[PDB]
Amino acid sequence: MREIIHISTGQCGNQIGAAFWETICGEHGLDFNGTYHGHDDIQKERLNVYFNEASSGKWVPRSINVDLEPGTIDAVRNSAIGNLFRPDNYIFGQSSAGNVWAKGHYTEGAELVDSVMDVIRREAEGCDSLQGFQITHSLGGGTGSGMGTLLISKIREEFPDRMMATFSVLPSPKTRVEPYNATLSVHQLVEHSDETFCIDNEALYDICQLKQPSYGDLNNLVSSVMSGVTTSLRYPGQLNSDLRKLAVNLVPFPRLHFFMVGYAPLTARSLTVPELTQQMFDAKNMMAAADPRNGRYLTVAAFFRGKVSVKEVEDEMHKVQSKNSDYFVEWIPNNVQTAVCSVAPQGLDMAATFIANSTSIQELFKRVGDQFSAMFKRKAFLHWYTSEGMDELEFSEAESNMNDLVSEYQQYQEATV
Amino acid sequence: MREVISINVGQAGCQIGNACWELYSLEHGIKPDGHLEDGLSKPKGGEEGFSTFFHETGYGKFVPRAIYVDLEPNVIDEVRNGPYKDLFHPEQLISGKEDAANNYARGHYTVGREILGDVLDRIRKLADQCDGLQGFLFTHSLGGGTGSGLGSLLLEELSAEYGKKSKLEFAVYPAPQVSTSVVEPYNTVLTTHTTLEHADCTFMVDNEAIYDMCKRNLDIPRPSFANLNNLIAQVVSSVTASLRFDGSLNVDLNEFQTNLVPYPRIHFPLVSYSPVLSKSSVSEITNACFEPGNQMVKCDPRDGKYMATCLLYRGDVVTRDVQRAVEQVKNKKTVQLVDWCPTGFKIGICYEPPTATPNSQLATVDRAVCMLSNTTSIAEAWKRIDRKFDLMYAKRAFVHWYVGEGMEEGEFTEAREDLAALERDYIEVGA
Amino acid sequence: LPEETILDKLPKDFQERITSSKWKDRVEALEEFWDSVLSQTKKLKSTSQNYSNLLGIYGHIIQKDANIQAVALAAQSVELICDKLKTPGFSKDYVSLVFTPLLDRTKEKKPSVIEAIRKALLTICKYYDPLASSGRNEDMLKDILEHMKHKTPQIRMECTQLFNASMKEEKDGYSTLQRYLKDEVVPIVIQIVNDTQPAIRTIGFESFAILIKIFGMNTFVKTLEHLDNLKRKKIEETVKT
Ligand SMILES: Nc1nc2c(ncn2[C@@H]2O[C@H](COP(=O)(O)OP(=O)(O)OP(=O)(O)O)[C@@H](O)[C@H]2O)c(=O)[nH]1
Ligand SMILES: Nc1nc2c(ncn2[C@@H]2O[C@H](COP(=O)(O)OP(=O)(O)OP(=O)(O)O)[C@@H](O)[C@H]2O)c(=O)[nH]1
Ligand SMILES: [Mg+2]
Ligand SMILES: [Mg+2]
């Protein structure tokens, strides 16, 4: 049945995870009690991918909510979406990772890993044919970043051949140790992640600033994307039905699996397919502080939803590919996979989601690497990390590793013939 | 009777299989029950070639001699739940739990190797019910993971366990208009390599050709797989017509080899079909087979040279009109025929009229023709996929997926060198 | 070279500290005893000195503790004790306390932690050859081999590499290796050679190449012909190296 086990790590991961579940709940025609009230069959077909059928007929998310601190997890508890969540799928410690990667990856986080691992093992046992895991977290914090990347590695040790998708929120210059946490996590993602959707918190803020937004306003934006990103996974289906098919199509090289994401429409009367398409590829619609025009597209997985003709979408996507042929590498025939789904979001007529493996994402890492090197050269804040069990060479590793990532992304930008 | 077992692998093979067996069942007056239509007594085909493809149980039911194989239950579940759920025995439909994910490696080395035991078992069970098993019809895609990996794996084993039995392959060549993956050129080259020696005759089906045919002839702005399969099933039906009914040529899986292939490697005939008309004469359809827009593979038949040929006519046909049409092609000169071919064109007639399903967009025709020609212009198909392959492989793009699934990276080279050889052997034999 | 004692030099609160829920207590307890004692040790006294508890504690930390720093420390201490106690001091009773935990924790990836585990494993195997012609250490051989079938690809790599080391460094016959050959070694080696990941397939090639160098190219000829032509050629090429 190709089930997916969701894991929400940290305050960010749990609030984005909540918004996500709260969003896809509606698209599948589900109450917040788990009962199905949809008026279509498409909503019920691939329903068990993310949801578990409780004997009562209700549908419970296959989610595991993890946080070293009981703060945010208690907020999700007595929320609307907190009703259908399985009580014993709430994992929480007494301490906190104090916004340092070390406390999450080696110390306090390392002590809670085995308790969550038990629950995912119980979930995985109740899967007809588990396909992989999906993780929501912030790379800027301590729990989501540190314990998340720890959990990823420990998950691969026990499930070597299951897919590993990640929704990672990058921090923006806006909490003084985020370049450390982020760089240390990216080093883990490049080694132990099959798919990483980079959600720059700067881009979310900029876009919401629709006309200062709160985290909730950002989360709706994130939740809208994730819904769109996972349209191929939650509806049948033809293109990129599995996490695996998607990875094969989006990943030309092993350590180049960090994807930009574009979404449309945003705005603050109905659009045309060309407008929806042009808006999608727009740099103002990218969920990452990086202009796609400064790089090349290695691959693309465009997902359209709603009342649209398959032909009109394909004709338009092809027209864009021909016109902007310079922004696509020539040594990969048919970079862009275009899918279409009848089920629209709510409340919209049509929408388009845009997963890209653009080389311009090097601007994201290159930006953090500068903030990382700025601090590291002064040996700043290291005490808070090395007192937990880390060494300086671990920082230098993550730095040079992320540098090699930029060099790699740049290397294929220039590739000829 | 000389039975023929039809094996289908992957989504394309199984969906094409559905369209084929739906048409077969109509052309022989058999309902989706497996029972005969109202007031028939016996199926239209036999007593003759009907038992070739169907099996009579003894209690008034007729079962297709077919095997569906896929590494995901999705496509086959549509068969298990569809209106033809009773046509096939539940044992004939085999499904896994996780697919090959557009990857030839996990279809050949990893996941496809898990189901292989079951398939070969059902095949043996089906083969044991045959008084004289003639061979196999292998239908699959070369762009998929299960169609390519498990498919070539199955041909390899079939050659081993059934060495004296022939195998005709129906390979779906990938097209960008309906592509499902970026690494389809990889899978296609690999499959060609590992099946170049485990198939007596291979009929290539370029989806780009069928797509354009549905778009031009039938006037469909965006044909679905269902549109493609309806046309494909019409061609496959025409080819297997001589076997399933009374024919004067290609009435044997072995006669395809004899009449079309000069050397073992040169076993890739170019198929042509006419007429293709929407619901909305012999001389004309015969001449249409030698024009660019009537082939199953995107190419210009007027280019390259013909080495062998088999014109298979169907329906209301009189030998006079075809004898005229054939000499018309020779005399006024579309030759373009190699100087070392002794007897030129071989003719075949099957008076059974061609049939189109009601749930389709194809018009019922009085007479139709299908030409099977071993021409060198089919090398264009391999040339086009070769440029796709080389562009990506020059950068080792996506290769880590294959090498990461038990395959040795060397096989990319050996397979490409083999396809380059197949190309050379074709332009060289046309000389 | 005088012989020393170390059991009378533990922190008087070691037992409570090492068994503390606080990670810092366990790490400090180990690190203290290492710096103040085990590091400055050159020779140990086995006479009227029982290390069972201490090694049992270490072995427990190595197997079940989550804090990899404490794991690295325990493995370093076990390696110190074993090398400085030597044989027949470090008995098989002591080996059984720490060998399986180490084999289980080869799953670790962190360079400093896995280096400690490897050193400990190699030191114990140095004094106790798993392939001994006496056949006394076959229990350890079964342990390695059973771990070369582990679900975790990292453990398969580390243990198969350990197994290869035992084969290479063997210089006292191969009678113990011949018995387990066709029924235990080869069936496992084939799984390694045919693994999905190329990093593991390489280790397999090395293993088969070593087996070929020892028992000859001929005795496996029926087995090699079953592999892929390219996997077979890889081994053929590796044998030359
Ligand atoms: N987009 C978005 N980002 C968030 C949200 N909440 C937190 N973040 C980001 O997360 C980063 C810090 O990590 P947090 O998620 O706050 O907390 P944590 O990672 O679990 O670390 P702990 O404090 O130990 O719990 C900040 O830089 C924020 O930008 C949110 O609701 N939406
Ligand atoms: N003519 C035709 N071609 C098809 C059909 N379905 C898929 N294809 C083609 O097959 C190729 C992909 O392979 P699949 O059909 O998915 O075969 P598969 O082995 O099941 O692929 P996996 O997903 O890896 O299991 C694409 O290039 C399609 O063009 C079909 O119904 N008819
Ligand atoms: Mg927090
Ligand atoms: Mg399929």
Coordinates of C-alpha atoms in Angstrom, one line a residue, chain B residues 4-427:
Chain B
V4 CA 1.0 -20.1 -27.5
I5 CA 1.4 -18.6 -24.1
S6 CA 1.2 -14.8 -23.8
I7 CA 3.3 -13.2 -21.1
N8 CA 2.9 -9.5 -20.1
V9 CA 5.3 -7.7 -17.8
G10 CA 4.9 -4.2 -16.2
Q11 CA 2.3 -1.6 -16.5
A12 CA 2.6 -1.2 -20.3
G13 CA 2.6 -4.9 -20.9
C14 CA -0.3 -5.5 -18.7
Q15 CA -2.4 -2.6 -20.0
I16 CA -1.6 -3.5 -23.5
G17 CA -2.5 -7.1 -22.5
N18 CA -5.9 -5.9 -21.3
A19 CA -6.6 -4.2 -24.7
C20 CA -5.4 -7.2 -26.6
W21 CA -7.4 -9.8 -24.7
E22 CA -10.5 -7.6 -24.9
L23 CA -10.1 -7.6 -28.6
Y24 CA -9.2 -11.3 -28.9
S25 CA -12.3 -12.1 -26.8
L26 CA -14.5 -10.1 -29.2
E27 CA -13.0 -11.6 -32.4
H28 CA -13.7 -15.1 -31.0
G29 CA -17.2 -14.3 -29.6
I30 CA -16.3 -14.7 -25.9
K31 CA -17.8 -12.6 -23.1
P32 CA -15.7 -11.2 -20.2
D33 CA -17.1 -14.3 -18.3
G34 CA -15.0 -16.5 -20.5
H35 CA -18.4 -17.9 -21.8
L36 CA -19.5 -17.7 -25.4
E37 CA -21.8 -14.9 -26.6
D38 CA -25.6 -15.7 -26.8
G39 CA -26.2 -18.3 -29.4
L40 CA -22.7 -19.3 -30.6
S41 CA -22.3 -23.0 -29.8
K42 CA -18.6 -22.8 -30.5
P43 CA -16.1 -19.9 -30.5
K44 CA -15.6 -18.2 -33.9
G45 CA -11.9 -19.1 -34.3
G46 CA -11.7 -22.9 -34.2
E47 CA -11.8 -25.7 -34.6
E48 CA -8.3 -24.7 -35.8
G49 CA -6.3 -21.9 -34.3
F50 CA -8.6 -20.8 -31.4
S51 CA -7.1 -23.3 -28.9
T52 CA -3.7 -21.7 -29.7
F53 CA -4.5 -18.7 -27.4
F54 CA -7.5 -19.9 -25.3
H55 CA -8.0 -23.0 -23.1
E56 CA -11.3 -24.8 -23.0
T57 CA -11.9 -26.0 -19.4
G58 CA -14.7 -28.5 -20.0
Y59 CA -17.6 -26.7 -18.2
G60 CA -18.3 -24.2 -21.0
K61 CA -15.6 -21.6 -20.0
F62 CA -12.6 -20.4 -22.1
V63 CA -9.5 -19.0 -20.4
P64 CA -6.8 -17.0 -22.0
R65 CA -3.3 -18.7 -22.0
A66 CA -1.9 -15.5 -20.4
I67 CA 0.4 -14.5 -17.6
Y68 CA 0.4 -11.0 -16.1
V69 CA 3.4 -10.0 -14.0
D70 CA 4.1 -6.7 -12.2
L71 CA 6.0 -5.7 -9.1
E72 CA 3.1 -3.5 -7.9
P73 CA -0.5 -4.6 -7.3
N74 CA -2.0 -1.4 -8.7
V75 CA -2.4 -2.1 -12.4
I76 CA -3.3 -5.8 -11.8
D77 CA -5.8 -4.9 -9.1
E78 CA -7.7 -3.0 -11.9
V79 CA -7.8 -6.4 -13.7
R80 CA -8.9 -8.1 -10.4
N81 CA -11.7 -5.6 -9.9
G82 CA -12.5 -4.8 -13.6
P83 CA -15.3 -6.3 -15.7
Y84 CA -12.7 -9.0 -16.9
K85 CA -12.0 -10.2 -13.4
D86 CA -13.3 -13.6 -14.3
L87 CA -11.5 -14.0 -17.6
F88 CA -8.2 -14.8 -16.1
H89 CA -7.7 -17.4 -13.4
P90 CA -6.4 -15.6 -10.2
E91 CA -3.2 -17.6 -10.5
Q92 CA -2.4 -16.1 -13.9
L93 CA -2.2 -12.6 -12.4
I94 CA 1.0 -12.1 -10.4
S95 CA 1.8 -8.9 -8.4
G96 CA 4.5 -7.9 -6.0
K97 CA 4.5 -5.3 -3.2
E98 CA 7.1 -2.8 -4.3
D99 CA 8.0 -1.9 -7.9
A100 CA 11.3 -1.3 -9.8
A101 CA 10.8 2.5 -9.6
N102 CA 11.9 3.3 -13.2
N103 CA 15.1 1.3 -12.5
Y104 CA 16.3 -1.6 -14.6
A105 CA 18.6 -2.7 -11.8
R106 CA 16.1 -3.5 -9.1
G107 CA 13.9 -5.2 -11.8
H108 CA 16.8 -7.4 -12.8
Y109 CA 19.0 -7.8 -9.6
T110 CA 17.0 -6.8 -6.6
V111 CA 13.2 -6.8 -6.3
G112 CA 12.3 -8.4 -9.6
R113 CA 14.4 -11.4 -8.5
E114 CA 12.0 -12.0 -5.6
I115 CA 9.0 -12.8 -7.7
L116 CA 10.8 -14.8 -10.4
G117 CA 10.2 -18.1 -8.6
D118 CA 6.4 -17.7 -8.7
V119 CA 6.3 -16.6 -12.4
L120 CA 8.3 -19.5 -13.7
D121 CA 6.1 -21.8 -11.7
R122 CA 2.8 -20.6 -13.2
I123 CA 4.5 -20.7 -16.6
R124 CA 5.4 -24.3 -16.0
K125 CA 1.8 -25.0 -14.9
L126 CA 0.5 -23.4 -18.0
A127 CA 3.0 -25.1 -20.2
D128 CA 2.1 -28.5 -18.8
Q129 CA -1.5 -28.0 -20.0
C130 CA -0.2 -27.8 -23.6
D131 CA -0.1 -30.7 -26.0
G132 CA 2.5 -28.9 -28.1
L133 CA 3.6 -25.6 -26.6
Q134 CA 4.7 -23.5 -29.6
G135 CA 6.4 -20.6 -27.9
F136 CA 5.8 -17.3 -26.2
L137 CA 4.6 -13.8 -26.8
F138 CA 6.5 -11.4 -24.6
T139 CA 4.9 -8.0 -24.2
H140 CA 6.6 -5.2 -22.1
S141 CA 8.1 -1.7 -22.1
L142 CA 11.8 -1.0 -22.3
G143 CA 11.5 2.3 -20.5
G144 CA 10.1 1.0 -17.2
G145 CA 11.9 -0.8 -14.4
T146 CA 9.7 -3.9 -14.2
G147 CA 9.2 -4.1 -18.0
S148 CA 12.9 -3.8 -18.6
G149 CA 14.6 -5.5 -15.6
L150 CA 12.2 -8.3 -14.8
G151 CA 11.3 -8.7 -18.4
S152 CA 14.8 -9.4 -19.7
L153 CA 15.3 -11.6 -16.6
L154 CA 12.2 -13.6 -17.6
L155 CA 13.4 -13.9 -21.3
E156 CA 16.8 -15.2 -20.0
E157 CA 15.1 -17.9 -17.8
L158 CA 12.6 -18.8 -20.6
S159 CA 15.5 -19.4 -23.0
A160 CA 17.0 -21.8 -20.4
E161 CA 14.0 -23.8 -19.3
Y162 CA 12.4 -23.8 -22.8
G163 CA 15.4 -23.8 -25.2
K164 CA 13.6 -25.4 -28.1
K165 CA 10.6 -23.0 -27.9
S166 CA 10.4 -19.8 -29.8
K167 CA 9.8 -16.3 -28.3
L168 CA 8.3 -13.3 -30.1
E169 CA 8.8 -10.0 -28.3
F170 CA 6.6 -6.9 -28.3
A171 CA 8.7 -4.1 -26.9
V172 CA 7.3 -0.6 -26.2
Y173 CA 10.0 1.8 -27.2
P174 CA 9.9 5.0 -25.0
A175 CA 8.6 8.4 -26.2
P176 CA 8.9 11.8 -24.6
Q177 CA 5.3 12.7 -25.2
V178 CA 4.3 10.1 -22.6
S179 CA 7.5 9.5 -20.6
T180 CA 7.3 8.5 -16.9
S181 CA 11.0 8.8 -16.1
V182 CA 14.2 10.6 -17.1
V183 CA 16.3 7.4 -17.2
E184 CA 14.2 5.6 -19.8
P185 CA 17.1 5.7 -22.3
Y186 CA 19.3 3.8 -19.8
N187 CA 16.7 1.1 -19.2
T188 CA 16.1 0.7 -22.9
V189 CA 19.7 0.2 -23.9
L190 CA 20.2 -2.2 -21.0
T191 CA 17.2 -4.3 -21.9
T192 CA 18.1 -4.5 -25.6
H193 CA 21.5 -5.8 -24.5
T194 CA 20.3 -8.5 -22.2
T195 CA 17.5 -9.6 -24.5
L196 CA 19.3 -9.4 -27.9
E197 CA 20.1 -13.1 -27.6
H198 CA 16.9 -14.3 -25.8
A199 CA 14.3 -13.4 -28.4
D200 CA 13.7 -15.0 -31.9
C201 CA 11.8 -12.0 -33.2
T202 CA 11.3 -8.5 -31.8
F203 CA 8.5 -6.1 -32.9
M204 CA 9.4 -2.6 -31.7
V205 CA 6.6 -0.2 -30.8
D206 CA 7.6 3.5 -30.7
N207 CA 5.0 5.2 -28.5
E208 CA 5.9 8.4 -30.4
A209 CA 4.7 6.8 -33.6
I210 CA 1.4 5.5 -32.0
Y211 CA 0.9 8.9 -30.2
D212 CA 1.3 10.8 -33.5
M213 CA -1.0 8.3 -35.2
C214 CA -3.7 8.8 -32.6
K215 CA -3.1 12.5 -32.9
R216 CA -3.2 12.8 -36.7
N217 CA -5.4 9.9 -38.0
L218 CA -7.9 9.7 -35.1
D219 CA -7.6 13.4 -34.3
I220 CA -7.1 13.1 -30.6
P221 CA -5.4 16.3 -29.2
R222 CA -3.9 14.4 -26.2
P223 CA -4.2 10.6 -26.6
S224 CA -4.1 8.6 -23.3
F225 CA -2.5 5.2 -22.9
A226 CA -6.0 3.8 -23.6
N227 CA -5.9 5.4 -27.0
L228 CA -2.4 4.1 -27.7
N229 CA -3.3 0.5 -26.5
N230 CA -6.5 0.4 -28.6
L231 CA -4.4 1.0 -31.8
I232 CA -1.6 -1.3 -30.6
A233 CA -4.0 -4.1 -29.9
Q234 CA -5.4 -3.7 -33.4
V235 CA -1.9 -4.2 -34.8
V236 CA -1.0 -7.1 -32.5
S237 CA -4.4 -8.7 -33.4
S238 CA -3.6 -8.4 -37.1
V239 CA -0.2 -10.1 -36.6
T240 CA -1.6 -13.0 -34.5
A241 CA -4.6 -13.4 -36.9
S242 CA -3.0 -16.0 -39.0
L243 CA -2.3 -18.1 -35.9
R244 CA -5.7 -17.6 -34.4
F245 CA -7.6 -18.1 -37.7
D246 CA -6.9 -19.6 -41.1
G247 CA -3.9 -18.0 -42.8
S248 CA -1.6 -18.8 -45.7
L249 CA 1.5 -17.1 -44.2
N250 CA 3.1 -16.7 -40.8
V251 CA 0.8 -19.4 -39.4
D252 CA 3.6 -20.4 -37.0
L253 CA 5.8 -18.6 -34.5
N254 CA 8.7 -20.2 -36.4
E255 CA 7.7 -18.8 -39.8
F256 CA 8.3 -15.3 -38.5
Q257 CA 12.0 -16.2 -37.9
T258 CA 12.2 -18.1 -41.2
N259 CA 10.6 -15.3 -43.3
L260 CA 12.1 -12.1 -41.7
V261 CA 15.4 -12.8 -40.0
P262 CA 18.5 -13.7 -42.1
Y263 CA 20.9 -13.7 -39.1
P264 CA 20.0 -14.1 -35.4
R265 CA 20.9 -10.5 -34.3
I266 CA 18.9 -9.0 -37.2
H267 CA 15.5 -9.8 -35.8
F268 CA 13.8 -6.3 -35.5
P269 CA 11.1 -6.0 -38.2
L270 CA 9.4 -2.7 -38.9
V271 CA 5.6 -3.0 -38.6
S272 CA 3.2 -1.1 -40.8
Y273 CA -0.6 -1.0 -40.6
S274 CA -3.4 0.4 -42.7
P275 CA -6.1 1.7 -42.5
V276 CA -6.2 3.7 -39.3
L277 CA -9.5 5.6 -39.3
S278 CA -11.8 7.2 -36.6
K279 CA -15.5 6.5 -36.2
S280 CA -16.2 10.1 -37.2
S281 CA -9.3 -0.4 -50.8
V282 CA -6.5 -2.9 -51.2
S283 CA -4.3 -0.9 -53.5
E284 CA -4.4 2.2 -51.2
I285 CA -3.7 0.4 -47.9
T286 CA -0.9 -1.7 -49.5
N287 CA 0.8 1.5 -50.8
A288 CA 0.3 3.1 -47.4
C289 CA 2.7 0.7 -45.7
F290 CA 5.6 2.2 -47.6
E291 CA 4.9 5.8 -46.5
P292 CA 6.3 7.5 -43.3
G293 CA 3.1 7.9 -41.3
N294 CA 2.0 4.3 -41.1
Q295 CA 4.8 2.6 -39.2
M296 CA 5.0 1.5 -35.6
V297 CA 8.4 3.2 -35.3
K298 CA 9.2 6.8 -36.1
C299 CA 11.2 6.6 -39.4
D300 CA 11.0 7.0 -43.1
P301 CA 10.6 3.6 -44.8
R302 CA 11.6 5.3 -48.1
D303 CA 15.1 5.5 -46.5
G304 CA 17.2 2.4 -46.0
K305 CA 16.7 -1.0 -47.7
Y306 CA 14.3 -3.8 -47.3
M307 CA 15.7 -7.3 -46.7
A308 CA 12.5 -9.3 -46.2
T309 CA 8.7 -8.7 -46.1
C310 CA 5.4 -10.3 -45.1
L311 CA 2.1 -8.6 -46.1
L312 CA -0.7 -9.9 -43.9
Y313 CA -4.1 -9.0 -45.3
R314 CA -7.4 -9.3 -43.4
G315 CA -11.1 -9.4 -44.2
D316 CA -12.8 -8.9 -47.5
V317 CA -9.8 -9.6 -49.8
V318 CA -9.6 -11.3 -53.2
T319 CA -6.2 -12.7 -54.4
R320 CA -6.5 -10.7 -57.7
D321 CA -6.6 -7.3 -56.1
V322 CA -3.6 -8.1 -53.9
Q323 CA -1.6 -9.8 -56.6
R324 CA -2.1 -6.6 -58.5
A325 CA -1.2 -4.4 -55.6
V326 CA 1.9 -6.3 -54.8
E327 CA 3.3 -6.3 -58.3
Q328 CA 2.3 -2.6 -58.4
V329 CA 4.8 -2.0 -55.6
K330 CA 7.5 -4.0 -57.3
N331 CA 7.0 -3.0 -60.9
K332 CA 6.7 0.8 -60.7
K333 CA 9.6 0.3 -58.3
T334 CA 9.8 0.8 -54.6
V335 CA 13.1 -1.2 -54.5
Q336 CA 14.9 -0.3 -52.3
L337 CA 15.2 -4.1 -52.1
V338 CA 18.6 -5.7 -51.3
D339 CA 20.2 -7.5 -54.2
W340 CA 20.8 -10.6 -52.2
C341 CA 17.2 -11.3 -51.2
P342 CA 16.0 -14.2 -53.3
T343 CA 12.1 -14.3 -53.2
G344 CA 10.9 -10.8 -52.5
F345 CA 7.6 -10.1 -50.8
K346 CA 5.6 -12.9 -49.1
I347 CA 1.8 -12.6 -49.0
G348 CA -0.7 -13.8 -46.4
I349 CA -4.5 -13.6 -46.3
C350 CA -7.0 -14.1 -43.4
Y351 CA -10.6 -13.7 -44.5
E352 CA -11.8 -13.0 -41.0
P353 CA -12.8 -9.4 -40.9
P354 CA -10.8 -7.0 -38.6
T355 CA -12.6 -5.9 -35.5
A356 CA -12.7 -2.8 -33.3
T357 CA -14.1 -2.7 -29.8
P358 CA -17.1 -0.5 -29.1
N359 CA -15.3 1.2 -26.2
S360 CA -12.8 2.9 -28.5
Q361 CA -12.3 5.5 -31.1
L362 CA -11.5 3.2 -34.0
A363 CA -13.7 2.6 -37.1
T364 CA -14.6 -1.0 -38.2
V365 CA -13.1 -1.7 -41.6
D366 CA -14.0 -4.2 -44.3
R367 CA -10.4 -5.1 -45.0
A368 CA -7.0 -4.2 -43.5
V369 CA -3.3 -5.0 -44.1
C370 CA -0.2 -5.3 -41.9
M371 CA 3.4 -5.4 -43.3
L372 CA 6.3 -6.9 -41.4
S373 CA 9.5 -5.8 -43.1
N374 CA 13.1 -6.2 -41.9
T375 CA 14.4 -2.8 -43.0
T376 CA 17.5 -0.9 -42.0
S377 CA 15.6 2.3 -41.4
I378 CA 14.7 1.0 -38.0
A379 CA 18.2 1.8 -36.9
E380 CA 17.0 5.4 -36.5
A381 CA 15.2 4.2 -33.3
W382 CA 18.4 3.1 -31.8
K383 CA 20.3 6.2 -33.0
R384 CA 17.8 8.5 -31.3
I385 CA 18.0 6.6 -28.0
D386 CA 21.8 6.4 -28.3
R387 CA 22.2 10.2 -28.3
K388 CA 19.9 10.4 -25.2
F389 CA 22.0 7.6 -23.6
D390 CA 25.4 9.2 -24.4
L391 CA 24.5 12.7 -23.3
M392 CA 23.6 11.5 -19.8
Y393 CA 26.2 8.7 -19.5
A394 CA 29.0 11.1 -20.5
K395 CA 28.4 12.7 -17.0
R396 CA 27.5 9.4 -15.3
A397 CA 24.1 11.0 -14.5
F398 CA 21.7 8.8 -12.5
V399 CA 24.1 5.9 -12.7
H400 CA 24.5 5.7 -8.9
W401 CA 20.9 4.4 -8.8
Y402 CA 21.9 1.4 -10.9
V403 CA 25.3 0.8 -9.3
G404 CA 23.5 1.2 -6.0
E405 CA 21.1 -1.6 -6.9
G406 CA 23.6 -4.5 -7.3
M407 CA 24.6 -3.7 -10.9
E408 CA 28.2 -3.3 -12.0
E409 CA 28.8 0.1 -13.8
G410 CA 30.6 -1.8 -16.6
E411 CA 27.3 -3.1 -17.9
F412 CA 26.4 0.4 -19.1
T413 CA 29.4 0.3 -21.4
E414 CA 29.0 -3.3 -22.5
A415 CA 25.3 -2.6 -23.3
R416 CA 26.1 0.5 -25.3
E417 CA 28.9 -1.2 -27.2
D418 CA 26.4 -3.9 -28.1
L419 CA 23.8 -1.5 -29.3
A420 CA 26.5 0.3 -31.4
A421 CA 27.3 -3.1 -32.8
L422 CA 23.6 -3.8 -33.5
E423 CA 23.5 -0.5 -35.4
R424 CA 26.7 -1.3 -37.4
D425 CA 25.3 -4.8 -38.2
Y426 CA 22.2 -3.3 -39.7
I427 CA 23.7 -0.7 -42.0

